[PDB]
Amino acid sequence: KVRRIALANQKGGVGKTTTAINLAAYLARLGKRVLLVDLDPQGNATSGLGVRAERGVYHLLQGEPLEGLVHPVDGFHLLPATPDLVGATVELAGAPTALREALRDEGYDLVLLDAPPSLSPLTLNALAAAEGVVVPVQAEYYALEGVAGLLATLEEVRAGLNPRLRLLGILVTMYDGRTLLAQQVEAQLRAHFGEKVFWTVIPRNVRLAEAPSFGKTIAQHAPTSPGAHAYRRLAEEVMARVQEA
Amino acid sequence: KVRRIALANQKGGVGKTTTAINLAAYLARLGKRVLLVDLDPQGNATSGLGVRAERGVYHLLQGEPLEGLVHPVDGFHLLPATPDLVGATVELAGAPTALREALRDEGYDLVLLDAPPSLSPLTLNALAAAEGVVVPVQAEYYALEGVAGLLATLEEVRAGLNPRLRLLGILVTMYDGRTLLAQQVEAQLRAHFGEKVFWTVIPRNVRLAEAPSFGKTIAQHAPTSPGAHAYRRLAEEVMARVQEA
Ligand SMILES: Nc1ncnc2c1ncn2[C@@H]1O[C@H](COP(=O)(O)OP(=O)(O)O)[C@@H](O)[C@H]1O
Ligand SMILES: Nc1ncnc2c1ncn2[C@@H]1O[C@H](COP(=O)(O)OP(=O)(O)O)[C@@H](O)[C@H]1O
Ligand SMILES: [Mg+2]
Numbered sequence: 001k002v003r004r005i006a007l008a009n010q011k012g013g014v015g016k017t018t019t020a021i022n023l024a025a026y027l028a029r030l031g032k033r034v035l036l037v038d039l040d041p042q043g044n045a046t047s048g049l050g051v052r053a054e055r056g057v058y059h060l061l062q063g064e065p066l067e068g069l070v071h072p073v074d075g076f077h078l079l080p081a082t083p084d085l086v087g088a089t090v091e092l093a094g095a096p097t098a099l100r101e102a103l104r105d106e107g108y109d110l111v112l113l114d115a116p117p118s119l120s121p122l123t124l125n126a127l128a129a130a131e132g133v134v135v136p137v138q139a140e141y142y143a144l145e146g147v148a149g150l151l152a153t154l155e156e157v158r159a160g161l162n163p164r165l166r167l168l169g170i171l172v173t174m175y176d177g178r179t180l181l182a183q184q185v186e187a188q189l190r191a192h193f194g195e196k197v198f199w200t201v202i203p204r205n206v207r208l209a210e211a212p213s214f215g216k217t218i219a220q221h222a223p224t225s226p227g228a229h230a231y232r233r234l235a236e237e238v239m240a241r242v243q244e245a
Numbered sequence: 246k247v248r249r250i251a252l253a254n255q256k257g258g259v260g261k262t263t264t265a266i267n268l269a270a271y272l273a274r275l276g277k278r279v280l281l282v283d284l285d286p287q288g289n290a291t292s293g294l295g296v297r298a299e300r301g302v303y304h305l306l307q308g309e310p311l312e313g314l315v316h317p318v319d320g321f322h323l324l325p326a327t328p329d330l331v332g333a334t335v336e337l338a339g340a341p342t343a344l345r346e347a348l349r350d351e352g353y354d355l356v357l358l359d360a361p362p363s364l365s366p367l368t369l370n371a372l373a374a375a376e377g378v379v380v381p382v383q384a385e386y387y388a389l390e391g392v393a394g395l396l397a398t399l400e401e402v403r404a405g406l407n408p409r410l411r412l413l414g415i416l417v418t419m420y421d422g423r424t425l426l427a428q429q430v431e432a433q434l435r436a437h438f439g440e441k442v443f444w445t446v447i448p449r450n451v452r453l454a455e456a457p458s459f460g461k462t463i464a465q466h467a468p469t470s471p472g473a474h475a476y477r478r479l480a481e482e483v484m485a486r487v488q489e490a
């Protein structure tokens with residue numbers, strides 16, 4: 001039974017936050033009760049949703065109620081990141097299951113954990129608290145190694161911290177349609193990882209890059225753009241995999 | 246073991262020929278030996294590939310060799326339709342398994358049967374000779390009924406003519422990205438038919454409409470266009486389903 005899904009990988013700039021935000025947008029639209037949790041001190045998901053918070057995840061880990069920390073956004077709830085969050089890293093280091101205990105998210109159908117571009121204690125807290133992992137990757141050649149490494153990390157976390165942890169899927173993001181290289185990398189990703197790679201692929205599209213600067217999801221910003229259609233179908237695909245898991 | 250795949254549905258103009266041609270283009274590129282068989286008297290696949298034939302399927306059914314009837318096209322082989330083909334309809338009516346016997350296609354890995362926009366004896370011959378069926382549909386509201394009817398036809402052919410017959414998949418084609426209606430119809434198609442609907446969806450795109458008028462596949466005509474990327478991924482998805490079947 002997959003409820004909590006971590007968005008994670010080694011690198012930054014690979015589409016974790018974009019996928020977190022827009023999956024939430026379309027899963028809410030599918031009639032699910034969704035909580036988006038921003039675990040990045042840089043607070044990109046919080047910012048990309050137009051929200052300025054004084055209280056967030058930091059304050060959840062200290063004991064303050066979930067209900068009075070969340071912000072209603074585009075038909076879902078955001079548990080924001082605040083500029084304080086950085087000061088939990090040292091405590092969470094040595095306490096990988098802290099988020100798992102602090103998350104009393106019984107009311108929500110699906111919980112999206114937007115992890116930072118590290119394997120920091122916050123990323124590890126994400127992995128330890130989740131049942132599913134979506135791994136965004138560019139259709140670029142380094143992705144095969146990056147993926148294999150992440151998969152080995154997942155295996156290690158499953159063996160030592162969280163036996164519920166499973167790869168939901170590898171998601172190809174920022175697929176550049178102007179070039180044949182993306183085709184070739186996608187084909188190799190599928191050749192090597194098979195059914196683990198989602199069939200839905202997220203196009204590189206200006207409207208997706210634009211959306212966070214406006215503090216809006218792609219469903220609010222550009223609902224008929226190539227990225228909107230893709231994330232809507234991805235939400236359907238994610239639900240199919242959750243249902244079959 | 247799925248080798249022969251029919252492209253079929255009730256209506257015309259829904260993307261059977263386009264899918265036949267472009268699947269062949271990308272399956273050949275995947276290293277498969279592909280035969281495309283044009284079963285439409287109007288010969289749209291033959292024309293869309295730039296080929297003018299005097300001899301084709303009509304002459305295959307009379308007994309003339311397969312090797313001397315096929316035309317090399319874009320890394321695959323086309324068994325063309327000729328303006329005579331119409332004169333087999335009456336003989337094939339009452340002989341649904343005629344194509345099944347006449348196809349001595351042992352050498353080919355995959356065989357694509359492009360059926361006419363009917364349930365003519367030629368379409369029935371296609372169904373009787375195939376192991377898999379791809380059903381192209383527009384993301385438009387009539388599709389749900391059209392699909393259900395085709396599925397009932399498939400069930401009947403499986404029960405009476407061809408126990409090997411199975412739906413490979415329902416393919417959403419000519420998905421118009423300018424509108425939210427296509428999203429809604431896709432979602433309903435998935436709600437109702439589930440895993441039977443391919444995840445890869447073919448965008449409505451000018452370059453795809455253009456290609457047959459040039460007698461070229463989308464891989465020849467516009468290799469980085471939205472339709473090219475989609476058909477390449479569809480070929481991968483079709484192979485996945487063939488392998489898991
Ligand atoms: N499909 C896409 N097309 C175009 N730009 C994208 C796409 N996905 C992400 N971006 C942009 O790339 C930058 C990094 O994306 P982000 O999702 O924050 O990556 P991560 O969270 O993994 O570091 C952001 O400015 C984002 O808007
Ligand atoms: N994805 C698409 N985008 C734009 N035009 C398309 C697309 N698919 C098919 N067409 C066009 O629609 C017309 C009918 O398509 P076709 O594949 O011949 O349908 P069918 O064989 O089912 O009758 C053709 O002119 C074709 O080029
Ligand atoms: Mg991020």
Ligand SMILES: [Mg+2]
Pocket residue numbers: 261262263285289290359360361362
């Ligand atoms: Mg046709």
